[PDB]
Amino acid sequence: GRRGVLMTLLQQSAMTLPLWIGKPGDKPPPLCGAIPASGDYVARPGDKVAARVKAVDGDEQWILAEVVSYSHATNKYEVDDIDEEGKERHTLSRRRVIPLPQWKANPETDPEALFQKEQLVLALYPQTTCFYRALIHAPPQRPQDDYSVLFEDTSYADGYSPPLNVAQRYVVACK
C-alpha cells in the first residue's frame, strides 16, 4: 500500500545515489554531499528537491519532491510531490527549492564534502517524506553509512530528539 510504496521509494533514491569517485587533484563537485549548488543553478526535470510548500490550511512544510519544469520567463519551478496522495503540482520560486545532492561524498576520500558535527541542516525525518531542522550528530564513516542527526523537537526537555539516522541523499543546508 501507500506506506510501503513511500518507504521503498526513499530507499531506492538513497541507495542509488552515486558515490563521487575523483582522482588525485579533483575536488568534489557542486551537489556532492554538502557542497552547495553553484549560484544561479537551475535543477533539471527529474531531479529530487526539498520543496517548501503551503497547504490550503497554511502550514509550511519542506517536502520531498521532483522537478517537473523550470520557466525562465517567470523564474518558477513546477514540482511534484514524491507521494501520489499529493495531487497538486506546485509552482515555486527558487528560494522554495533546495536541490538534493546528486553524489554521496566518500568520507574516506572527500570529508570536506560532508556536513560538520553540530552544523544546522534540513533532514528527512524517519517514517515521513518531509524535512526538518536538525543538528549533525555524527557524519558517515563509510560510503554506506547514514548521518546521525538530532532533530529539533519540543517534545524533549532539552529540545532535541535522540540521534536518528538520515542518508546523505536527504541532508541539505538550512539557510
Partner: peptide
C-alpha cells in the same frame, strides 16, 4: 506528502 505526527 507524509508529515511528522
Amino acid at each position: 506528502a507524509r508529515t511528522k505526527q
